[PDB]
Design a protein around this nucleic acid. Structure first.
Lengths: 159, 232, 92, 123, 416
RNA sequence: CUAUCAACUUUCGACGGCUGGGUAUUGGCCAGCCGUGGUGACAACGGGUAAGGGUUAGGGCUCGGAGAAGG
RNA sequence: UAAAUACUGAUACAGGGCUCUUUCGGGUCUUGUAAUUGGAAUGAGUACAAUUUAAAUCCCUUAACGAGGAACAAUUGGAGG
């Protein structure tokens, strides 16, 4: 349908994704989380199952940084979306932190091993960066934007 | 050649020693009430790494078990066998814990010299002589004439003679070595006969838990008198 | 080339000193365990011939490398207490 | 009791929980994160290689057949650093635990308002 | 009410989980066999006479002096003109130090290679207790370290990415912990002059770090309100989040940043936050052990003659004054001494309780030392000399310039 | 599981007891002598062939007849 | 299961590009080009070693090479001029 095609094209364009399999992957994990939230809303308030399982779900989503720290209700967990998940991806986080000029530049950098998340370099652009780990995204020490060797085209030109 | 899970739960093996486990060779103590010397050396103490290293320890006269040199690797050493290593100058003793597993205890020569062994049976041997059989299958010729069944004996271990004995008593503290309440150091406070098989004792700990264990599974350790050093 | 020894165990009945070794080459390639046998002569006051090194897995991202080192009291004690494959890898 | 044990450690018990330095629980250049259960296992494998310091075979074909089949019969998923457990029998124990865990000054005012004739009338 | 219901059910589960003279332990006795197979506490809070402290409030030709280290005969100052001056202190059996040497940042040779040393002004300095290494870090993105005697630069580490803000030694060892402005902290092995490990995890820029004899750290970051306790060998952390909470009510400010830190022993430390909060924190607990509020009082309300440009100055409108926060905070290791200095003109000293679970006041020490107290350094004669480093502004930025105050190292000692 | 299985065993003794033989030993296990049994509508017997136990949050884990071409 | 087959500028020149209900009609305002040039980034592969291991391999470390299309050569289907 044209609505599905235009929606998936807006996702693939707005966040520099490769195909629609990544969109369907995110929509599947989002539907799993939202199904768990609906099943926890089935029960009444102050049931211990709903209390502890909903607190676990909300603390998990706030810790992985999707759900905002302001709103912490299970209705907002139902109101979650795939734009929030693709915003929590690593590639859009490199683009928004401004190490790269565009989202396709960010995917290129993460593929050819320039950025690192915390200590180790990250080869995958779909790395779900958590909220505590959002700040420690920077260029690695072996990268010419970080330091070390001046690099490849630089070496061929400076010879 | 049993598997690591089919090995009993009281000589411990981690996720490390392969899927298989050594079987104890036939000897004084039983099969399911046993710690082999290889599990004592390289799986409990970790003075060794491999089977060949354990063999290179055992074959030279460096490990003595109950005061005699034990050469073969899977020699059974179940309960209260003093294990003297002279190059390290240590003597270990095997006791249990409150959960039901084997425990090792480091000690020197003064408590290493004697063994507290529970009498299995008294009889008249050949030559018209009374003899005494312990749980270590030690038979002592010409014993003291009051040492009856279920009494324990301080064996000399340099000559093997009797030195002292502790009587089966309601009011003497005891150690459990079997059953569903295994390894619980407490005091024998009651004993019920049940003639016709399988009599019991009722026993409480130091802090008021009564339970009924069988007179086979009991083991007398001392009235107060901890003649072996239970670990503090 | 920076060395630290953790978990040094005596083992007199097997007559060999057992060390967990954490070596670090930052910026270098790997450590060449025969040259590490040469290095573990003056650190623990021994001959090179009575040292055997195994284990020796390099940590992620260079630098740290965890090896296991055994120093025997004599080369003949090494000869009678070492495995055949470690003796071949050492060269005796 | 899985969701209940994490509520005590983070909200109830006043003891700080060890957090890893950020890049350490990344498996293969980002291909997975090590969940706090899978990380605690990884020290247990490592803490067994300094005791008698013999090396290990990095899994085998018979363990990988088992543990990767455990994903086939479980509803767990690891969206980020955390685990997201299914709401089946793990949710019923939370109800199943909590049910066994739950198992002469007046007279003076009346005489003090019966003495005074009256205050007034309706305004 | 859902939260208190969850608290009730969790406490019930704790009671259920909770629901032995001859008790033994096979695995614990095995750990005992393996371990057998393989810093004194003082209490001198009352043994000193703070009202009888002898002070030298001197100054010299400098912009603003920032930090000091205590090599036991020496002293090491850093000034924003770009000087690091190694100095000799005094003994009693003449009250001003004699400067022996200094080194100046040369920004002309930023292009020129093989020049270890600073390009810009340094910000922090530390000295090894051996007396052979002195390390200093600045905002020139590099941390240099060299010989204490001839003061000639031997190593210029460029591993940090923004700036070096905090710097600390392990006591008795040449292991170095340098926490930076790119929210990281790098531990160095200075015996071989080599970087060993980095440590991430801080949310905002890291303002201070303290160390003790073991291989640990405690580092405070600014606006995340977080002190992280650092287990360096296993590379792990422990988070301690402050969230701090007849006078005007709007003047009570919450914990904005968390500026300074001081490890007093192995089990507890103290943090100083720029809303004037001084909080004792224990490692066994997730909360503050004891927080004391406005540790240097409120600021004076600013004058009407500067706040409003009117022919009538009316006091009907004037904003509520804010607390003068802690600018410097130090301790003696394994002692009961909490030295806290703000821009109030006085240097306060606090102590621990007898149960060491509370902070208590012992009074103002100079009973002024005007300016903004940039730094505190402590030394024991055998009876302690403390130098206090003050200037016209703060350490890292020219936010609050003060025409009052002097660019002075102020050396005072308590003899008892 | 079944009464479209009510009689079954004595049809290689079916139940005893005595005596021996043989077995590592007890024993109708086998041989001599005699006695009258034994089971069954509370489900024997016959028929159908589709041949679990322990470890307990859970899943997991553990244990489980005939032939060597034919007598 | 994860994701390569490219990222980013400047200049020159053209004046059209796109859309629709309603169509010899309406709507919107920056888009191109097989144009000319410049930067960097590099992993597939090649690969000295050391390490791993019974001996090898993989993994982790790793010096040196390794991108301009006419290539280090993206496919499978459908519709139309």
């Amino acid at each position: 349908e044209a609505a599905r095609l235009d929606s998936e094209l807006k996702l693939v364009g707005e966040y520099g994704l490769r195909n629609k399999r990544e969109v369907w992957r995110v929509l599947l994990t989002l539907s799993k989380i939202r199904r768990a939230a609906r099943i926890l809303l089935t029960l009444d308030e102050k049931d211990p199952k709903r209390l502890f399982e909903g607190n676990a779900l909300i603390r998990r989503l706030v810790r992985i940084g999707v759900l905002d720290e302001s709103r912490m209700k299970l209705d907002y967990v139902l109101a979650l979306k795939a734009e929030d998940f693709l915003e929590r991806r690593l590639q859009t986080l490199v683009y928004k932190l401004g190490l790269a000029k565009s989202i396709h530049h960010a995917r290129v950098l993460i593929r050819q091993r320039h950025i690192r998340v915390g200590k180790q370099i990250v080869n995958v652009p779909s790395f779900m960066v958590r909220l505590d780990s959002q700040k420690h995204i920077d260029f690695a020490l072996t990268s010419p934007f970080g330091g070390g060797r001046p690099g490849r085209v630089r070496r061929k030109k400076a010879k | 050649h049993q598997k690591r899970l089919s090995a009993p739960s009281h000589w411990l093996l981690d996720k490390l020693s392969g899927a298989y486990a050594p079987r104890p060779s036939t000897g004084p103590h039983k099969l399911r009430d046993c710690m082999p010397l290889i599990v004592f050396v390289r799986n409990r103490l970790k003075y060794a790494l491999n089977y060949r290293e354990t063999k290179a320890i055992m074959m030279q006269r460096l490990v003595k078990v109950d005061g005699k040199v034990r050469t073969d690797i899977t020699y059974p050493a179940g309960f209260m066998d003093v294990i003297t290593i002279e190059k390290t100058g240590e003597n270990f003793r095997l006791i249990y814990d409150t959960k039901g597993r084997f425990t090792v205890h480091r000690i020197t020569d003064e408590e290493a010299k004697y063994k507290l062994g529970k009498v299995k049976r008294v009889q008249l041997g050949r030559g018209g002589v009374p003899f005494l059989v312990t749980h270590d299958a030690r038979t002592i010729r010409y014993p003291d004439p009051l040492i009856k069944v279920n009494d324990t004996v301080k064996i000399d271990l340099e000559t093997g003679k009797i030195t002292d004995f502790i009587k089966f008593d309601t009011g003497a503290l005891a150690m459990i070595t079997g059953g569903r309440n295994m390894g619980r150091v407490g005091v024998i406070t009651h004993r019920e006969r049940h003639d016709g098989g399988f009599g019991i004792v009722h026993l409480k700990d130091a802090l008021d838990n009564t339970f009924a264990t069988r007179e086979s599974n009991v083991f007398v350790i001392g009235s107060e008198k901890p003649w072996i050093s239970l670990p503090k | 080339v920076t060395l630290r020894t953790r978990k040094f165990i005596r083992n007199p009945l097997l007559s060999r000193k057992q060390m967990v070794v954490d070596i670090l080459h930052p910026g270098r390639p790997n450590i060449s365990k025969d040259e590490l046998r040469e290095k573990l002569a003056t650190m623990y006051k021994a001959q090179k011939d009575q040292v055997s090194v195994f284990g020796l897995r390099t940590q992620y991202g260079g630098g740290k490398t965890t090896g296991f080192a055994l120093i025997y009291d004599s080369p003949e004690a090494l000869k009678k207490f070492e495995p055949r494959y470690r003796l071949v890898r050492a060269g005796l | 009791s899985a969701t209940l044990d994490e509520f005590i450690a983070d909200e109830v018990s006043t003891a700080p929980i060890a957090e890893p330095s950020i890049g350490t629980n990344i498996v293969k250049r980002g291909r997975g994160l090590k969940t706090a259960a899978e990380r605690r296992m990884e020290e247990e494998r490592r803490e067994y290689e300094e005791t008698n310091f013999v090396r290990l075979p990095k899994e085998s074909k018979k363990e990988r057949a088992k543990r990767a089949r455990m994903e086939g019969r479980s509803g767990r998923m690891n969206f980020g650093g955390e685990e997201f457990r299914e709401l089946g029998e793990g949710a019923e124990r939370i109800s199943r635990l909590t049910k066994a865990k739950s198992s002469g000054e007046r007279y003076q005012k009346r005489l003090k308002v019966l003495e005074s004739g009256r205050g007034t009338r309706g305004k | 009410t859902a939260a208190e219901k969850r608290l009730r059910l969790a406490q019930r589960y704790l009671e259920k989980t909770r629901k032995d003279e001859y008790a033994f332990d096979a695995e614990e006795i095995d750990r005992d066999l393996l371990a057998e197979r393989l810093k004194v506490y003082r209490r001198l809070a009352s043994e000193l006479a703070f009202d009888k402290a002898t002070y030298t409030q001197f100054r010299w030709n400098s912009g603003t002096v920032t930090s000091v280290a205590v090599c036991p005969p020496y002293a090491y100052t850093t000034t924003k003109d770009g000087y690091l001056t190694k100095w000799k202190l005094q003994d009693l059996p003449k009250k001003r130090p004699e400067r022996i040497c200094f080194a100046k940042a040369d920004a002309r040779k930023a292009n020129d290679k093989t020049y270890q040393g600073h390009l810009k002004a340094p910000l922090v300095v530390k000295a090894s207790q051996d007396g052979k290494f002195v390390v200093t870090g600045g905002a020139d993105k590099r941390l240099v370290v060299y010989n204490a005697a001839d003061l000639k630069p031997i190593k210029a580490f460029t591993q940090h990415r923004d700036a070096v803000t905090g710097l600390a030694f392990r006591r008795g060892t040449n292991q170095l912990y340098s926490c930076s402005k790119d929210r990281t902290v790098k531990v160095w092995s200075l015996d071989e002059l080599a970087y060993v490990e980095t440590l991430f995890g801080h949310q905002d820029e890291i303002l201070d770090i303290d160390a003790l004899g073991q291989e640990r750290c405690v580092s405070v970051g600014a606006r995340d309100r977080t002190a992280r306790y650092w287990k360096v060998p296993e590379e792990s952390q422990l988070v301690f989040r402050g969230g701090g909470e007849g006078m005007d009510p709007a003047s009570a400010a919450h914990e904005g940043s968390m500026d300074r830190v001081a490890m007093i022993d192995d089990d507890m430390f103290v943090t100083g936050s720029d809303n004037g909060d001084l909080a004792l924190w224990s490692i066994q607990r997730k909360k503050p052990l004891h927080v004391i509020a406005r540790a240097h009082g409120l600021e004076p309300p600013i004058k009407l003659e500067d706040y409003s440009a009117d022919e009538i100055p009316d006091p009907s409108i004037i904003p509520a004054p804010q607390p003068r926060g802690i600018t410097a905070l130090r301790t003696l290791p394994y002692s009961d001494l909490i030295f806290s200095g703000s821009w109030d003109g006085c240097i306060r000293v606090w102590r621990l309780s007898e149960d060491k679970r509370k902070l208590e006041a012992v009074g103002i020490l100079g009973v002024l030392v005007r300016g903004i107290v940039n730094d505190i350094a402590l030394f024991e004669r055998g009876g302690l000399c403390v130098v206090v480093v003050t200037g016209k502004e703060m350490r890292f930025g020219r936010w609050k310039y003060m025409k009052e105050g002097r660019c002075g190292a102020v050396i005072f000692e308590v003899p008892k």
